[PDB]
Amino acid sequence: SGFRKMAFPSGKVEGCMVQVTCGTTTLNGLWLDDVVYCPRHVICTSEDMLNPNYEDLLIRKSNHNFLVQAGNVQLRVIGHSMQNCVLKLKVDTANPKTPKYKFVRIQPGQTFSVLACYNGSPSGVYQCAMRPNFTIKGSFLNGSCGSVGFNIDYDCVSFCYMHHMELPTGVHAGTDLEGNFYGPFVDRQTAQAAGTDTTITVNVLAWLYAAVINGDRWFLNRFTTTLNDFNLVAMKYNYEPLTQDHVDILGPLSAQTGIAVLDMCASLKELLQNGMNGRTILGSALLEDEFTPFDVVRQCSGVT
């Protein structure tokens, strides 16, 4: 028992982290096989970030200008190319620590672990979720760019995020491993405000099932609701509309606990309307939305 914001073990990703330097800018890179992936803003100076022309900036850069260091050893750069907002540095050596891996573009609401890095060195790991407005509420300082988000399915690492920037609102934006930004963000130091950060309803319900599984049951009530009635409440509280796909994905949790999805929705409805009244659920005084139904099952069953 017990429920924690748990991240995947980071070892497989740690063995991929390298330091990439170009001119006077140093950030993190991801070394998989004979390719190093890093944010293209590594070629920029502070003056360039105002409105950079990455194609024109990359013309003045040769393979020898990209310094790639893995631990204390220097990798030899034999090719460089830009794919969207990432640079792919072909090195002469395949990473001997390359795990089985995939590049996946996640959907908003999905979760992933982040290995925060500085100068190619890991500092920590934490669990995140892609917000419905395509930002992530991370913990990153200057030099953390190139740090990646990922999920692990037994031995396969699915890289889904690469950190690129911090918005003036303190929230984070980045790309998938093909260099495509999540959301409308551009890799430019400009006015970029995030949209409405709605609550991931399916995740809150999954976390409510996790609470019941771990003994916290005070919020269970004698009521039920319908998808349309629940969604009227969810709209009022800036919660994502619940769909039959969401109900279907909560099936195993509903089966495990014996609490119908719509009954759990009615508990959530009353919690939205009446608040927690000074009470807590799984050590939290607010409704947690960064655990997917998959995460709850995984943690409550011990998937390694």
Nearest to 22 by CA among 62, 74, 59: 62
Contact flags string 167-186 toward ligand M4L, x per CB under 6 A? -----x--------------
Q: How many CB atoms lie within 10 A of CB 117?
A: 27
CA distance 241 to 58: 44
In this complex, which beta carbon is closest to ligand M4L, that of residue 38 or of residue 208?
38
166 binds ligand M4L (CB under 6 A): yes
Which listed residue (41, 80, 172, 246) is catalytic?
Answer: 41
Positions touching a copy of itself (CB under 8 A) are 1-12, 14-15, 115-119, 121-126, 137-141, 143-144, 166, 170-172, 214-215, 275-276, 278, 280, 283-286, 298-304
Within 8 A by CB and 6+ apart from 26, the residues are 19, 20, 119, 143
277, 279, 280, 281: CA torsion to nearest 10 = -80
The item of ligand M4L, a copy of itself, none sharing an interface with residue 145, based on CB under 5 to 8 Å by kind, is: ligand M4L
> Among this protein's residues, is 172 annotated catalytic?
no
Tell me the CB-side half-sphere exposure of residue 30, using CA atoms within 13 A.
35
> Among this protein's residues, is 41 annotated catalytic?
yes
Stretch 94-153 residues interacting with ligand M4L (CB under 6 A) = 140-142, 144-145
The item of ligand M4L, a copy of itself, none sharing an interface with residue 126, based on CB under 5 to 8 Å by kind, is: a copy of itself
Single-letter amino acid, residue 201: T
Sign of the Cα torsion 211, 287, 130, 126 reads negative
| Shortest distance in whole angstroms from residue 78 CB to a copy of itself | 28
Which of 49, 57, 58, 106 touches ligand M4L by CB under 6 A? 49
188 binds ligand M4L (CB under 6 A): yes
The item of a copy of itself, ligand M4L, none sharing an interface with residue 165, based on CB under 5 to 8 Å by kind, is: ligand M4L
Nearest to 205 by CA among 261, 272, 245: 261
CA distance 37 to 19: 11
CA distance 230 to 270: 10
Size of the site for ligand M4L (CB under 6 A): 14
Single-letter amino acid, residue 129: A
87 binds ligand M4L (CB under 6 A): no
Binding site for ligand M4L (CB under 6 A): 41, 49, 140-142, 144-145, 164-166, 172, 187-189
Catalytic residue set: 41, 145
